[PDB]
Design a protein around this ligand. Sequence first.
Ligand SMILES: CCc1cccc(CC)c1O
Ligand SMILES: CCc1cccc(CC)c1O
Lengths: 168, 168, 168, 168
Amino acid sequence: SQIRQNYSTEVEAAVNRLVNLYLRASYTYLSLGFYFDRDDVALEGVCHFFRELAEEKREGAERLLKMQNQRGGRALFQDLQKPSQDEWGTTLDAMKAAIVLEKSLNQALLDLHALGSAQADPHLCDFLESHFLDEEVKLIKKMGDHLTNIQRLVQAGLGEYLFERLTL
Amino acid sequence: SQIRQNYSTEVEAAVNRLVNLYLRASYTYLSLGFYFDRDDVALEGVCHFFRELAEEKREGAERLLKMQNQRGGRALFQDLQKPSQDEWGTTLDAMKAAIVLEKSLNQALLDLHALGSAQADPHLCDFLESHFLDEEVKLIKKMGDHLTNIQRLVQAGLGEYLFERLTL
Amino acid sequence: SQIRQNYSTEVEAAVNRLVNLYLRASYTYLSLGFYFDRDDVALEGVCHFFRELAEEKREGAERLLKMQNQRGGRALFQDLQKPSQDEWGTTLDAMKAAIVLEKSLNQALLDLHALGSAQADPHLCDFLESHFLDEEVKLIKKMGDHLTNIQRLVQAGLGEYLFERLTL
Amino acid sequence: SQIRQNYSTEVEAAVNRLVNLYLRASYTYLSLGFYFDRDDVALEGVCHFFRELAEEKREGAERLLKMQNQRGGRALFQDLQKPSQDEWGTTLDAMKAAIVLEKSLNQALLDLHALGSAQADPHLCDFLESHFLDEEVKLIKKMGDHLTNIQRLVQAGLGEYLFERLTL
Ligand SMILES: CCc1cccc(CC)c1O
Ligand SMILES: CCc1cccc(CC)c1O
């Protein structure tokens, strides 16, 4: 590449993997959103919460792809694995599964930051810090806050309804 | 002081102590506010309630300091003791601890009013009446109203959630 | 903590200490502000300068406390020591004491950044860089500029008056 | 009087005396204002400061007269003594003379408050507190602040000019 400078093959490859992880997270949230839209689940606030997250994760993937080209690396796409579950249980179950998912994305971000630091690639390090690291910390805090409120609420059917109506 | 008139050393000293008490109350409310912001407590309305009170108590301290200088007394600051607890339990526990705190500030205000009256210092007496006495009575009534509603609500987890969502 | 990830006990503890340092700085500035409001000092611009800084330092402490919870650490408060002086001398004396204070806060920030880097905690490192490091550099430059102008001005009484009227 | 209730002859008489004191203060400030308007003194900011105070003191007298009638007492006017000086010296001299004057009015207010309290006349006590006591404390603080700045400024001719230009 005529533009490529200080951009290691290791980082290029890790950025392609992180794109896959963000698209997979987007897909998992799409499944979670539509599960809560089922007439036999019917929690519209929970559905909107996960659909909004699907869109956020897709946006993350696209920003990473933009960066990959800005640096002169080459986007390589892999299959996107189907989500780990077809049915997601209660709001509590689903929020637990979301925080597991977010912590795995955060750990991927931290790993790539570490790699960037080892490779002396400050543009990569700044890029993750300014667009992803604080967003993940904020989101995981929010999910943790939700999980605590869900747990304090679950006569389980009444709790789930009230959380969806008054928090989401 | 060239301006000092009818301002006893006793009152000057009691005003410095009351500044300390208001700053300590502010600090206690800061701790209460951040405790309810913990991801394993997560009651944002309770958090905002106490943070707003932190700011009110700090404002009170500053008005007292302004008055101290208006009268020609000299502000003397002491250490601010850390709050009595590191963790504040339930909303009920925290509201009980707040009303204990407010009654101790109110009693300090009443003591200083009594002192002012004994010293024939009507400016001090008017100052407490117009800026602090009615504010404390209003706040203690509000906390009493909250305590009653909290108590009537505590399936405890559901009650705490509903109070935070629908009152705070 | 269900949310805690890559957040060392060392950093958690250093963040609690830095909160104390910022609250202590806030308190020191409150004392400086009210000293310049004394009828026998009476430099209102100097008073507003330090009171504004009291508020900035309190805001800093609250942002650190917010971050502590966002990361799943636990806020622990200690006593707040009274400021080092009861009377602050001239504007020159007070500005010298402020720059000493700011350099000690800056060094604390730098120490915590170093710790964060040693612990591979990029979120902490970005947080200090984006909210505190440049603010301190800007403020210390401003105080240095003030100190130079104060010094060039001190017939001392006339200089102090003119600085307060035409700079602050 | 058909309306008179709980209004002692002692208080009625002291209120008439206080009216005289406020009108005398108004007159003294009128003289001070016009002295600083002399072409051989020529400090327009000092002139406006004292003329504004003339008007404030006259307003005070009129509020006291209104109150006297509201209570069913009878206004009795005495001669208004000419001010203590025909020429008022420097701004420093004049500000010293103003603070002496204000402290004598404040002491009169405090004496009348004490009388009102001895007579169990809470309307009188509230009236002085709400309209006069805090106004005097604020004004005496302001004059004290001015006196300190004037003193710090007095090459005397330059100091007097700068105070008038940059403070008043
Ligand atoms: C409002 C936060 C707070 C609490 C306790 C003490 C201080 C000193 C100013 C403070 O700002
Ligand atoms: C405000 C000028 C002034 C001074 C002193 C006395 C009187 C009588 C009304 C007056 O108007």
